[PDB]
Amino acid sequence: YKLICYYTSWSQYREGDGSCFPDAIDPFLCTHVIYSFANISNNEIDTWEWNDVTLYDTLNTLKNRNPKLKTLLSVGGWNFGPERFSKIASKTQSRRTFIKSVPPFLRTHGFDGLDLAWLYPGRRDKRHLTALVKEMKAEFAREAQAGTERLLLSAAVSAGKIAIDRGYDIAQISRHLDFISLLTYDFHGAWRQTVGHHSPLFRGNSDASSRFSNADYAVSYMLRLGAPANKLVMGIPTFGRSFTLASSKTDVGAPISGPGIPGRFTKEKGILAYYEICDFLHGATTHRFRDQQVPYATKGNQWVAYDDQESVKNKARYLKNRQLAGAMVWALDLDDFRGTFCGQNLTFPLTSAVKDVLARV
Ligand SMILES: CC(=O)N[C@@H]1[C@@H](O)[C@H](O[C@H]2O[C@H](CO)[C@@H](O[C@@H]3O[C@H](CO)[C@@H](O[C@@H]4O[C@H](CO)[C@@H](O[C@@H]5O[C@H](CO)[C@@H](O)[C@H](O)[C@H]5NC(C)=O)[C@H](O)[C@H]4NC(C)=O)[C@H](O)[C@H]3NC(C)=O)[C@H](O)[C@H]2NC(C)=O)[C@@H](CO)O[C@H]1O
Ligand SMILES: *[C@@H]1O[C@H](CO)[C@@H](O[C@H]2O[C@H](CO)[C@@H](O)[C@H](O)[C@H]2NC(C)=O)[C@H](O)[C@H]1NC(C)=O
């Protein structure tokens, strides 16, 4: 089983304990660590933060402690305009120029592969997304001829039925991609004003519409479309999505006036790192949707939907039963990486639970 863990560029800037460097990563925890995110300029892969070349190095020296560890760089991300990806992928000339610029870059910085996080291609991109994956892979095969190990190629895909129908030719890209990471946790889409869990496992028996929104449907749908199980990786979040209530109602359906207050370290409305949620729980009331098998908490007018150790062990058990390739975690720097925020003195509590269940067979 594979354990793909994302580490983000900008977590170095958080204050105090919030700050996280490649340093803090247990080399034996995951099988693959993906650095986010690389940028694109003058049509070539390129760096993003001034000090990336350094952190690139830091991350990749973990391979000295664990020689089996594989690292990848990710291009794209949500703060990267899809129009930009779209503009590069549509013109064979600008597309070829980018592809050709990738291998040398990965090799200089010691990465073992590239990860595509185009979020998200639209109806008019489906065809180009395919041209890009296909041609890029071909470039990796051709490059392995130089006598070095073939570079890996992966992609982060939307887990929403409509997004999948609109911009992905799943059957096509799965034959060229090494693994596909299902973004099964952006379900309660930023849009509406009703409390809801962003990463439910199951349908949530007590609800008629938007049954398409849960890990289970997404996974079954991908297999129906043609993605083989041995390349599917299910995304497990390590953060919580918060809300500022607009009434005293706290159960399913309750109204929402907007996103929740920022976390002390995370400084971003609507989300909270797991280690922040641990602190938050003190004095909070905890509930758990039996149907979807995921927890949620409230305190004051703040409602938080999140994942704890057992909801995470659950998804992991599920993924094994459907015989998928492994799990994907977003993200290491949001988990309790110091191990000093969540009761127990364990480091990376959430990612380990996934790893424990995965190591059982
Ligand atoms: C599978 C997959 O691909 N993942 C999906 C993700 O894309 C989803 O969301 C996540 O991605 C977005 C980015 O795409 C991420 O956005 C980040 O937001 C933060 C926090 O609000 C930004 O952090 C700030 O970054 C700037 C610079 O980049 C920092 O400023 C710098 O300051 C130093 C001095 O401090 C200077 O030396 C630098 O020059 C300087 N830059 C400037 C401004 O001059 C700043 O310190 C920092 N933090 C602060 C103040 O809080 C960060 O840049 C954004 N990311 C990028 C790469 O642009 C978003 O936070 C993230 N969401 C979560 C919850 O992780 C993900 C969401 O669910 O799921 C996947 O589907
Ligand atoms: C990512 O690459 C982009 C595009 O090359 C960089 O974009 C900006 O840089 C120019 C400065 O000379 C601006 O004139 C442009 O408005 C802008 N390019 C755009 C929007 O296409 C950007 O600096 C890079 N980002 C990082 C973190 O390096």
mmCIF file of C-alpha atoms in Angstrom, residues 55-312:
data_model
loop_
_atom_site.group_PDB
_atom_site.id
_atom_site.type_symbol
_atom_site.label_atom_id
_atom_site.label_comp_id
_atom_site.label_asym_id
_atom_site.label_seq_id
_atom_site.Cartn_x
_atom_site.Cartn_y
_atom_site.Cartn_z
ATOM 1 C CA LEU A 55 13.913 23.311 1.090
ATOM 2 C CA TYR A 56 14.033 21.110 -2.059
ATOM 3 C CA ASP A 57 17.369 19.902 -0.794
ATOM 4 C CA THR A 58 16.211 19.477 2.821
ATOM 5 C CA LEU A 59 13.275 17.345 1.788
ATOM 6 C CA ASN A 60 15.354 15.244 -0.547
ATOM 7 C CA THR A 61 18.069 14.511 1.995
ATOM 8 C CA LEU A 62 15.506 12.465 3.944
ATOM 9 C CA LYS A 63 16.171 9.874 1.246
ATOM 10 C CA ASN A 64 19.514 9.456 3.020
ATOM 11 C CA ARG A 65 17.810 8.127 6.105
ATOM 12 C CA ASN A 66 15.181 6.167 4.174
ATOM 13 C CA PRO A 67 16.541 5.084 0.804
ATOM 14 C CA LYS A 68 13.131 3.771 -0.326
ATOM 15 C CA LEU A 69 11.440 7.151 0.077
ATOM 16 C CA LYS A 70 10.325 8.753 -3.214
ATOM 17 C CA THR A 71 9.642 12.467 -3.590
ATOM 18 C CA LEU A 72 7.709 14.410 -6.205
ATOM 19 C CA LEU A 73 7.157 18.052 -7.076
ATOM 20 C CA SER A 74 3.622 19.278 -7.764
ATOM 21 C CA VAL A 75 2.732 21.906 -10.411
ATOM 22 C CA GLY A 76 -0.546 23.726 -10.119
ATOM 23 C CA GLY A 77 -2.588 24.021 -6.970
ATOM 24 C CA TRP A 78 -5.589 26.182 -6.230
ATOM 25 C CA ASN A 79 -3.692 29.546 -6.226
ATOM 26 C CA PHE A 80 -2.590 28.764 -9.759
ATOM 27 C CA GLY A 81 -5.161 29.898 -12.289
ATOM 28 C CA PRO A 82 -6.522 26.957 -14.331
ATOM 29 C CA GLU A 83 -6.611 29.398 -17.261
ATOM 30 C CA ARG A 84 -2.866 29.381 -17.041
ATOM 31 C CA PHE A 85 -2.715 25.606 -17.207
ATOM 32 C CA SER A 86 -5.277 25.752 -19.985
ATOM 33 C CA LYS A 87 -3.271 28.270 -21.992
ATOM 34 C CA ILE A 88 -0.133 26.065 -21.774
ATOM 35 C CA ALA A 89 -1.867 22.793 -22.575
ATOM 36 C CA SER A 90 -3.845 23.997 -25.627
ATOM 37 C CA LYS A 91 -0.953 24.986 -27.905
ATOM 38 C CA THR A 92 1.256 22.027 -28.818
ATOM 39 C CA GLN A 93 4.224 24.452 -28.992
ATOM 40 C CA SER A 94 3.883 25.857 -25.449
ATOM 41 C CA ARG A 95 2.958 22.388 -24.188
ATOM 42 C CA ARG A 96 6.029 20.701 -25.682
ATOM 43 C CA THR A 97 8.252 23.485 -24.288
ATOM 44 C CA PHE A 98 6.975 22.851 -20.755
ATOM 45 C CA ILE A 99 7.214 19.054 -20.999
ATOM 46 C CA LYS A 100 10.774 19.328 -22.313
ATOM 47 C CA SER A 101 11.733 21.577 -19.402
ATOM 48 C CA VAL A 102 10.564 19.223 -16.674
ATOM 49 C CA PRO A 103 12.987 16.259 -16.471
ATOM 50 C CA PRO A 104 16.194 18.323 -16.115
ATOM 51 C CA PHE A 105 14.547 20.312 -13.337
ATOM 52 C CA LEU A 106 13.461 17.283 -11.346
ATOM 53 C CA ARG A 107 16.899 15.742 -11.834
ATOM 54 C CA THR A 108 18.820 18.838 -10.682
ATOM 55 C CA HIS A 109 16.820 18.933 -7.484
ATOM 56 C CA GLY A 110 16.637 15.213 -6.937
ATOM 57 C CA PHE A 111 12.920 14.611 -7.350
ATOM 58 C CA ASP A 112 11.672 11.217 -8.479
ATOM 59 C CA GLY A 113 8.639 12.487 -10.327
ATOM 60 C CA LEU A 114 6.121 15.182 -11.174
ATOM 61 C CA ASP A 115 2.590 15.615 -9.846
ATOM 62 C CA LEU A 116 -0.084 17.506 -11.795
ATOM 63 C CA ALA A 117 -2.517 19.574 -9.774
ATOM 64 C CA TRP A 118 -4.489 21.340 -12.539
ATOM 65 C CA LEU A 119 -7.532 22.572 -10.560
ATOM 66 C CA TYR A 120 -9.578 22.296 -12.617
ATOM 67 C CA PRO A 121 -9.821 21.633 -16.346
ATOM 68 C CA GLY A 122 -13.156 22.418 -17.969
ATOM 69 C CA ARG A 123 -15.218 21.004 -20.818
ATOM 70 C CA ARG A 124 -12.838 22.620 -23.331
ATOM 71 C CA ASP A 125 -9.771 21.163 -21.609
ATOM 72 C CA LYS A 126 -10.575 17.462 -21.386
ATOM 73 C CA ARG A 127 -8.779 16.821 -24.706
ATOM 74 C CA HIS A 128 -5.684 18.821 -23.797
ATOM 75 C CA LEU A 129 -5.404 17.372 -20.311
ATOM 76 C CA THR A 130 -5.068 14.085 -22.203
ATOM 77 C CA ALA A 131 -2.493 15.364 -24.692
ATOM 78 C CA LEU A 132 -0.434 16.683 -21.771
ATOM 79 C CA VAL A 133 -0.445 13.512 -19.677
ATOM 80 C CA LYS A 134 0.268 11.344 -22.713
ATOM 81 C CA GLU A 135 3.129 13.450 -24.092
ATOM 82 C CA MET A 136 4.623 14.076 -20.662
ATOM 83 C CA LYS A 137 4.715 10.343 -19.916
ATOM 84 C CA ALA A 138 6.303 9.663 -23.287
ATOM 85 C CA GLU A 139 8.977 12.191 -22.362
ATOM 86 C CA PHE A 140 9.671 10.275 -19.160
ATOM 87 C CA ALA A 141 10.067 6.932 -20.958
ATOM 88 C CA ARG A 142 12.384 8.488 -23.553
ATOM 89 C CA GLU A 143 14.412 10.100 -20.781
ATOM 90 C CA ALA A 144 14.942 6.853 -18.839
ATOM 91 C CA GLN A 145 17.029 5.732 -21.792
ATOM 92 C CA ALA A 146 19.873 7.806 -20.365
ATOM 93 C CA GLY A 147 20.244 4.958 -17.884
ATOM 94 C CA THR A 148 18.619 6.486 -14.829
ATOM 95 C CA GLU A 149 15.326 5.470 -13.123
ATOM 96 C CA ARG A 150 12.078 6.414 -14.971
ATOM 97 C CA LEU A 151 10.505 9.514 -13.391
ATOM 98 C CA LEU A 152 6.999 9.044 -11.938
ATOM 99 C CA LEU A 153 3.938 10.921 -13.161
ATOM 100 C CA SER A 154 0.815 11.492 -11.065
ATOM 101 C CA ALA A 155 -2.241 13.734 -10.949
ATOM 102 C CA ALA A 156 -4.622 15.135 -8.317
ATOM 103 C CA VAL A 157 -8.209 14.727 -9.487
ATOM 104 C CA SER A 158 -11.549 16.293 -8.514
ATOM 105 C CA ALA A 159 -13.827 13.912 -6.621
ATOM 106 C CA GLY A 160 -17.045 15.620 -7.694
ATOM 107 C CA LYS A 161 -19.115 13.752 -10.292
ATOM 108 C CA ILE A 162 -19.856 16.853 -12.325
ATOM 109 C CA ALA A 163 -16.205 17.984 -12.373
ATOM 110 C CA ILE A 164 -15.170 14.484 -13.426
ATOM 111 C CA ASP A 165 -17.671 14.406 -16.302
ATOM 112 C CA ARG A 166 -16.782 17.907 -17.444
ATOM 113 C CA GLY A 167 -13.001 17.826 -17.704
ATOM 114 C CA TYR A 168 -11.435 14.372 -17.389
ATOM 115 C CA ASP A 169 -11.094 11.437 -19.771
ATOM 116 C CA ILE A 170 -10.375 9.040 -16.906
ATOM 117 C CA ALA A 171 -10.013 5.891 -19.001
ATOM 118 C CA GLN A 172 -7.380 7.637 -21.106
ATOM 119 C CA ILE A 173 -5.196 9.261 -18.480
ATOM 120 C CA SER A 174 -5.087 6.231 -16.169
ATOM 121 C CA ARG A 175 -3.050 4.251 -18.665
ATOM 122 C CA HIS A 176 -0.311 6.894 -18.597
ATOM 123 C CA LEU A 177 -0.355 8.023 -14.919
ATOM 124 C CA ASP A 178 1.504 6.098 -12.215
ATOM 125 C CA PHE A 179 -1.128 6.857 -9.563
ATOM 126 C CA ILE A 180 -4.171 9.131 -9.338
ATOM 127 C CA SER A 181 -5.013 10.968 -6.101
ATOM 128 C CA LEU A 182 -8.743 11.410 -5.458
ATOM 129 C CA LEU A 183 -9.474 14.754 -3.787
ATOM 130 C CA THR A 184 -12.198 13.277 -1.604
ATOM 131 C CA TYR A 185 -12.600 16.183 0.833
ATOM 132 C CA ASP A 186 -13.807 19.368 -0.910
ATOM 133 C CA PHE A 187 -17.374 18.064 -0.949
ATOM 134 C CA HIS A 188 -19.316 20.702 0.919
ATOM 135 C CA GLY A 189 -18.360 23.264 -1.717
ATOM 136 C CA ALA A 190 -17.559 26.790 -0.540
ATOM 137 C CA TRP A 191 -20.929 27.910 -1.945
ATOM 138 C CA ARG A 192 -23.946 27.140 0.265
ATOM 139 C CA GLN A 193 -25.168 28.328 3.611
ATOM 140 C CA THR A 194 -25.932 25.105 5.412
ATOM 141 C CA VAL A 195 -23.718 23.314 7.854
ATOM 142 C CA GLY A 196 -22.258 20.109 6.349
ATOM 143 C CA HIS A 197 -19.254 17.762 6.381
ATOM 144 C CA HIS A 198 -16.667 18.293 3.648
ATOM 145 C CA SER A 199 -15.345 14.721 3.668
ATOM 146 C CA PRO A 200 -18.100 12.222 4.503
ATOM 147 C CA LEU A 201 -17.288 8.585 3.805
ATOM 148 C CA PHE A 202 -20.817 7.441 3.046
ATOM 149 C CA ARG A 203 -24.059 8.750 1.590
ATOM 150 C CA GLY A 204 -25.457 9.777 4.953
ATOM 151 C CA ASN A 205 -28.602 7.594 4.812
ATOM 152 C CA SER A 206 -30.791 10.431 6.036
ATOM 153 C CA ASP A 207 -30.410 12.666 2.872
ATOM 154 C CA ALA A 208 -31.865 12.593 -0.652
ATOM 155 C CA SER A 209 -29.874 15.006 -2.842
ATOM 156 C CA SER A 210 -26.183 15.276 -3.593
ATOM 157 C CA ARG A 211 -25.523 11.622 -2.864
ATOM 158 C CA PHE A 212 -22.668 12.167 -5.277
ATOM 159 C CA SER A 213 -20.840 13.885 -2.420
ATOM 160 C CA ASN A 214 -18.811 11.349 -0.434
ATOM 161 C CA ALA A 215 -15.687 9.226 -0.744
ATOM 162 C CA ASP A 216 -17.772 6.147 -1.547
ATOM 163 C CA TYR A 217 -19.607 7.472 -4.592
ATOM 164 C CA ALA A 218 -16.477 9.107 -5.964
ATOM 165 C CA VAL A 219 -14.480 5.891 -5.694
ATOM 166 C CA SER A 220 -17.175 3.668 -7.199
ATOM 167 C CA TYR A 221 -17.652 6.188 -9.992
ATOM 168 C CA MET A 222 -13.948 6.295 -10.865
ATOM 169 C CA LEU A 223 -13.832 2.518 -11.095
ATOM 170 C CA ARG A 224 -16.958 2.544 -13.291
ATOM 171 C CA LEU A 225 -15.290 5.102 -15.565
ATOM 172 C CA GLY A 226 -12.271 2.850 -16.025
ATOM 173 C CA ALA A 227 -9.566 3.842 -13.552
ATOM 174 C CA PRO A 228 -7.954 0.655 -12.308
ATOM 175 C CA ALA A 229 -7.973 0.069 -8.559
ATOM 176 C CA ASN A 230 -4.198 -0.393 -8.416
ATOM 177 C CA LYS A 231 -3.671 3.239 -9.434
ATOM 178 C CA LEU A 232 -6.347 4.874 -7.291
ATOM 179 C CA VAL A 233 -5.314 6.691 -4.154
ATOM 180 C CA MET A 234 -7.989 8.048 -1.833
ATOM 181 C CA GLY A 235 -7.459 11.507 -0.374
ATOM 182 C CA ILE A 236 -7.762 11.872 3.384
ATOM 183 C CA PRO A 237 -7.759 15.354 4.892
ATOM 184 C CA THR A 238 -5.816 16.436 7.905
ATOM 185 C CA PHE A 239 -7.736 19.682 8.375
ATOM 186 C CA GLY A 240 -11.199 20.862 9.265
ATOM 187 C CA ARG A 241 -13.636 23.131 7.513
ATOM 188 C CA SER A 242 -15.170 25.705 9.906
ATOM 189 C CA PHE A 243 -18.374 27.809 9.938
ATOM 190 C CA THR A 244 -19.849 30.720 11.833
ATOM 191 C CA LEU A 245 -23.406 29.706 12.736
ATOM 192 C CA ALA A 246 -26.319 32.078 12.165
ATOM 193 C CA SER A 247 -28.677 30.497 14.694
ATOM 194 C CA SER A 248 -28.660 28.355 17.802
ATOM 195 C CA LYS A 249 -29.409 25.302 15.653
ATOM 196 C CA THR A 250 -26.453 22.934 15.571
ATOM 197 C CA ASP A 251 -27.641 19.724 13.837
ATOM 198 C CA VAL A 252 -27.779 18.863 10.131
ATOM 199 C CA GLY A 253 -29.316 21.619 8.008
ATOM 200 C CA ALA A 254 -28.569 24.449 10.457
ATOM 201 C CA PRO A 255 -28.022 27.885 8.804
ATOM 202 C CA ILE A 256 -24.667 29.610 8.182
ATOM 203 C CA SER A 257 -23.715 33.296 8.127
ATOM 204 C CA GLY A 258 -20.266 32.639 6.678
ATOM 205 C CA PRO A 259 -16.926 30.824 7.207
ATOM 206 C CA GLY A 260 -15.496 30.274 10.691
ATOM 207 C CA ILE A 261 -13.008 32.568 12.451
ATOM 208 C CA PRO A 262 -9.332 32.039 11.512
ATOM 209 C CA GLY A 263 -7.128 29.699 13.513
ATOM 210 C CA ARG A 264 -4.371 31.216 15.657
ATOM 211 C CA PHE A 265 -1.610 29.721 13.481
ATOM 212 C CA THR A 266 -3.300 28.991 10.184
ATOM 213 C CA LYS A 267 -4.645 32.544 9.771
ATOM 214 C CA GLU A 268 -7.190 31.619 7.069
ATOM 215 C CA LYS A 269 -11.014 31.764 7.343
ATOM 216 C CA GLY A 270 -12.904 28.481 6.922
ATOM 217 C CA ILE A 271 -10.112 26.081 7.711
ATOM 218 C CA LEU A 272 -8.266 24.820 10.741
ATOM 219 C CA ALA A 273 -5.238 22.563 11.042
ATOM 220 C CA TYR A 274 -5.788 19.339 12.948
ATOM 221 C CA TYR A 275 -3.482 20.478 15.738
ATOM 222 C CA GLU A 276 -5.635 23.614 15.987
ATOM 223 C CA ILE A 277 -8.777 21.476 16.181
ATOM 224 C CA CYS A 278 -7.212 19.585 19.088
ATOM 225 C CA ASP A 279 -6.907 22.745 21.093
ATOM 226 C CA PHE A 280 -10.345 23.865 19.928
ATOM 227 C CA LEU A 281 -12.028 20.706 21.266
ATOM 228 C CA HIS A 282 -11.528 21.763 24.901
ATOM 229 C CA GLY A 283 -14.926 23.081 25.921
ATOM 230 C CA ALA A 284 -16.480 21.998 22.635
ATOM 231 C CA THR A 285 -19.366 19.576 22.179
ATOM 232 C CA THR A 286 -18.527 16.648 19.916
ATOM 233 C CA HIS A 287 -20.942 14.883 17.603
ATOM 234 C CA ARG A 288 -20.514 12.217 14.980
ATOM 235 C CA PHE A 289 -22.647 11.403 11.951
ATOM 236 C CA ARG A 290 -23.154 7.649 12.275
ATOM 237 C CA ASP A 291 -24.333 7.523 8.648
ATOM 238 C CA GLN A 292 -21.221 9.167 7.142
ATOM 239 C CA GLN A 293 -18.919 8.075 9.948
ATOM 240 C CA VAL A 294 -17.235 11.438 10.419
ATOM 241 C CA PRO A 295 -17.113 13.773 13.459
ATOM 242 C CA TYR A 296 -18.055 17.412 13.985
ATOM 243 C CA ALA A 297 -17.850 19.834 16.914
ATOM 244 C CA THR A 298 -19.394 23.093 18.115
ATOM 245 C CA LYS A 299 -18.506 25.732 20.664
ATOM 246 C CA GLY A 300 -20.049 29.193 20.763
ATOM 247 C CA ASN A 301 -21.168 30.008 17.227
ATOM 248 C CA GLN A 302 -18.375 27.991 15.618
ATOM 249 C CA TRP A 303 -19.250 24.676 13.928
ATOM 250 C CA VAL A 304 -16.339 22.471 12.820
ATOM 251 C CA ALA A 305 -16.449 19.430 10.502
ATOM 252 C CA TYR A 306 -13.242 17.398 10.722
ATOM 253 C CA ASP A 307 -11.425 14.051 10.824
ATOM 254 C CA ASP A 308 -10.079 12.325 13.908
ATOM 255 C CA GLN A 309 -8.078 9.139 14.330
ATOM 256 C CA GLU A 310 -10.932 6.727 14.026
ATOM 257 C CA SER A 311 -12.720 8.385 11.137
ATOM 258 C CA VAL A 312 -9.325 8.231 9.482
#
